Symmetry: D2
């Protein structure tokens, strides 16, 4: 009798055991969902990581920049979940920006080829994935993507911020298409989570000033959040994604749900 009982859900974006998508997948399985996973490039690694999930889940390769992967995706999913079965949920937990577009590298010095790759993977692919999967989604279904509130500029996030602004806009158009299928489309705007890469950035991977700025941001986030914010714990974010995958937010689409401790509602 889990929140997601009987639901078939595709989860993208796992690359380490600290990936937000790993925690989404775990909580969804704890709540009764049957998963299909998609992974990029390092499939041996991803299989070994996802062996630790509560239940077995087929892993499919998906490079969202690869037109062939996208064209075959729905057939490969149907194969994995069985003919006559469709998906009830899709989780997009995919993002990337070349180093030139983040950190201490000057904003103006990011070449457009780099920015374009970042926007391709982080924003356009939300539409790509919806295009591929809506034909095999059930009415009442739910597409969820991960967001980091880009309403205001900030240090170091630079062109990734721009990519998230694009993603929010893409989400509102995907909602128009998804609606034709009886499917919702929404983003979860999460507070900062210490994934491997984030600890790497805080450790100086993209410049000392960038690391210092991110630590300041994390500290301010917990301070502003009326219920606090634990950057080491993705479970509250995973639960929020599962809420959107469930039947309990049936009139919300094209929208953004903030799983950020309430920080964005407070100035100081």
């Amino acid at each position: 009798t889990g929140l997601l009982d009987g639901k078939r859900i595709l989860v993208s974006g796992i690359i380490t055991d600290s990936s937000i998508a790993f925690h989404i997948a775990r909580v969804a399985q704890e709540q009764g969902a049957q998963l299909v996973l998609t992974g990029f490039d390092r499939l041996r690694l991803i299989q070994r990581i996802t062996d630790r999930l509560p239940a077995k889940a087929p892993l499919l390769e998906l490079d969202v920049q690869n037109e062939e992967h996208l064209a075959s995706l729905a057939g490969r999913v149907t194969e994995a979940i069985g003919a006559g079965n469709k998906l009830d949920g899709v989780v997009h937990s995919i993002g990337f920006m070349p180093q030139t577009g983040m950190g201490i590298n000057p904003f103006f010095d990011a070449p457009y080829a780099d920015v374009s790759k970042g926007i391709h993977i982080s924003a356009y692919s939300y539409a790509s994935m919806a295009k591929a999967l809506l034909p095999i989604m059930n009415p009442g279904g739910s597409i969820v993507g991960m967001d980091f509130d880009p309403s205001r500029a900030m240090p170091a996030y630079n062109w990734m911020t721009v990519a998230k602004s694009a993603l929010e806009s893409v989400n509102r158009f995907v909602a128009r298409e998804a609606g034709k299928y009886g499917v919702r489309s929404n983003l979860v705007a999460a507070g900062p989570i210490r994934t491997l890469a984030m600890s790497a950035i805080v450790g100086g991977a993209l410049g000392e000033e960038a690391g210092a700025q991110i630590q300041l941001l994390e500290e301010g986030w917990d301070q502003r959040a009326p219920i606090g914010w634990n950057m080491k714990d993705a479970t509250p974010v995973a639960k929020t994604v599962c809420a959107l995958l469930s039947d309990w937010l049936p009139a919300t689409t094209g929208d953004i749900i903030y799983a950020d401790g309430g920080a964005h509602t407070q100035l100081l």
Copy 2:
């Protein structure tokens, strides 16, 4: 094994069987919640209405303009749910504006005494109720109020719009206080629902032009909503309130969740 199993939840705002709060109460009981109800003025009526709910629930009198009712409320609730027990949830589903502040009556002609009464009941009372009940709420608890998106002006809603703008602001401050108790505070911004009064307004109760404008608004709402909007069905709104009352949005506070078909995310 309901969404709200084991939870003790106070629901205000029932006055007819079409009240949004009636549907909130029904769905919460279907999902395992144990309720306490509060009602204003017509308690015989409200008891008879709430006899139709799936389970029994104590009814307490609460006029939010009455300082004595508010001062005694927590003790009366504790009496009803038993010493040593606290609330896990509170639903504010209360609103009012004198006729001078809505409909075809000119915006400039509403006397401040009338506007002030409207803001008292519709906005300040969200803080009043939180003040009264937070001392008897459990960590992990949830306070939810009902909103109608006031971000833009519109015909006829007039000073009630202003009251909702005030309420949204109040909610962000209540979140600061509630956080000290481990409690969340949020609003659900619902699309238009045909309560008794709304059918009365559409029927011309506050002027012909106002009724005509509201019908146009309802029609445009369903058109804009990517998944449509059924003004005759409060259940999607009730489900959204229950989602916020649950454990599945644990990192959302001071915030607004839109149960409006996605209409506010679309221009046309």
Copy 3:
């Protein structure tokens, strides 16, 4: 050949030589405007203060809570500017909240009578003044009010924040009415300005914690602002108000212009 040449403009809100409205009045006169001033309660004081303005300007009494003052206001203005002449501009620079609604006094402990007085003076009066003056305003005219961005909660501002949220909503409805006269209505959302009272609050007038919080807010504001923010200098705010009073923002109404150094566009 000033920005406001030939324009007749009413300016409310002067009480000291540090009032934002004093600087609005000064800059408007430097730019060729002919002013009428309104003052509350201490008219001897206000006359002596406004003697320092670049040019003479009639002072009229206006308590916005006084129905008689409002009913006579248009006639008294016409008397001062001469029959057959109308106003081109109106500046609302009026705000008040009792001490119970601000500072370290708990948010929940503000009595509604106090909150209501604050909302009356700070929000409803924007509509009151528009109602009184639109009948004596020229097409192409402009009504401007002062705002402090209430989109997010913050320490100490408490119920004044709620009042500003109400004011923003009121402004969008006043724009609907003003449009019938060919008149615009907008707010200027200013950064923090060290008026007498603010220095008093920073000095602890409403509690030590409140003063400490406001200093932190001021410091963060200048840090966030990409062009910086000087809380001791109201002239940039006054210039912005004059821009809205001019003919150079002819397609902006119901809106908010931010004269805040850009701080609200930046997270950190």
Copy 4:
């Protein structure tokens, strides 16, 4: 004694006599500005068009996708305005999206190469131009770009909406860089203007449904606007751009000014 007396301003984006940038250039010259113009591809045409401006202005070639044009731009501008002189203003009035990304062509069918070209020209180039020109801008200067409010999805605008969402985000980062030079960066969000291309789209150039939808949008815009909206008249938009180029909005940056009749502040 014009609004922009003595100011040296670069204006991009003229391609016909109906271009918003043509009207910006005309009004800026009427107000005393000395201009430098930039044009894309059809320089004979653009010269012949700009011969009709009130005063002479040097025309320089600038394809914002051309790295060489951008690298040489500042030197070519300095040549045109004379060594030792710098710019006080820059107007970005540049936008493009391939047909696959707009109109009746399905949202999901736009190839990323097309979307990327659109985002390059419509969003990234705002940063490109700022990078090129900030080194030759005076303190107190102003960079202004043109926006179409992308906060909500709408029919037909499709990926251009996404490009504008990206542009708004870019603007907030350009403000951070520009601030180092004492320069402001802002967008003007205009209502719909009947440029040549728009009349072409309304005439069905991108599909009948798209044309029908745009006409509906135009009609609704004028209806919602409290002061109305004339899609045939760019002058109110041009005046707003000149307001931002002036000294009268000195504390506004990273921001968006709406020259849209107030339509975005009203639901209906």
